[PDB]
Amino acid sequence: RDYEIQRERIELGRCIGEGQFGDVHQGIYMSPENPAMAVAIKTCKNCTSDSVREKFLQEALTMRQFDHPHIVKLIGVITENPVWIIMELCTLGELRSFLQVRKYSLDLASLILYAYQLSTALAYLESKRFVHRDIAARNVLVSSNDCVKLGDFGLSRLPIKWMAPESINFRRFTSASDVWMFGVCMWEILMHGVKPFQGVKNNDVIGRIENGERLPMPPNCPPTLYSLMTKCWAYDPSRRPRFTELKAQLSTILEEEKLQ
Ligand SMILES: CN[C@@H]1CCN(C2C=C/C(=N\c3ncc(Cl)c(Nc4ccccc4S(=O)(=O)NC(C)C)n3)C(OC)=C2)C1
Numbered sequence: 001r002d003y004e005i006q007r008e009r010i011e012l013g014r015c016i017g018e019g020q021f022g023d024v025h026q027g028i029y030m031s032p033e034n035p036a037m038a039v040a041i042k043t044c045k046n047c048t049s050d051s052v053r054e055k056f057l058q059e060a061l062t063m064r065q066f067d068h069p070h071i072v073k074l075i076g077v078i079t080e081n082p083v084w085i086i087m088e089l090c091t092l093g094e095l096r097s098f099l100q101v102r103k104y105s106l107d108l109a110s111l112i113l114y115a116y117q118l119s120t121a122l123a124y125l126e127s128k129r130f131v132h133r134d135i136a137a138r139n140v141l142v143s144s145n146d147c148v149k150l151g152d153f154g155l156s157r158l159p160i161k162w163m164a165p166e167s168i169n170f171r172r173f174t175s176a177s178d179v180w181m182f183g184v185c186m187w188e189i190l191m192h193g194v195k196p197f198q199g200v201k202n203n204d205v206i207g208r209i210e211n212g213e214r215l216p217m218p219p220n221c222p223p224t225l226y227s228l229m230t231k232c233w234a235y236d237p238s239r240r241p242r243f244t245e246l247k248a249q250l251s252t253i254l255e256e257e258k259l260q
Contacts, residue, residue: 070120
């Protein structure tokens, strides 16, 4: 059982970014016999108290519950100071950069695959009654060309243009508001890592959305798919599909794309 890893099994590599609690490094988990595996190591800033430590480690506690091919995998924790969380490394990095950089080398079928894969992770999370609250390409990682994984999972310490009307207006976050965000995430993927509502102010966004305005159909996005996206953006959350539906729809759209 035990998620506690001995610190000498970890070789800290280069800083690859920042979480809310501190720096994230790439690195290696070493074990006897045993090829050696690339890991992400999340660190914590100024946690000179239990409370900050407890908040930071909650991410690990949350990820203990999940076992999915398209969700970042927790490997372990080191709970004596400095406290670290060890995760699997998604070696190709952040989705947006990957999409931007590989625009002329990715076919439409790959973009749909990523959407389908993310929807299986989200249908999984739905069944655990886990509300993610920030589904956006910034939180998707690339493990390989044919594999993406969803991250955080962790706590703080507002993503207006990704959020459902009911999340913005009534601080409501549910499975249906996550579906809305997934729709925007799919727009980002089809758009190759372009941000929704560029040059638009956050306080403008709810005005436009309640006036019925929606993100336009991406060039070379199939109609059946933009049709699925628009259903994610139904104002009335009770009419949006659930991730179980989306997973089955994205499957047929993907398969019809690989069939020409
Ligand atoms: C932009 N500068 C960096 C240079 C290379 N970068 C990355 C980013 C992610 C990355 N892969 C990760 N794989 C797993 C995990 Cl948990 C991970 N975590 C993060 C890396 C960087 C910043 C934040 C995280 S995070 O706190 O776990 N949250 C992410 C979902 C954004 N990265 C890379 O693998 C080599 C390289 C970006």
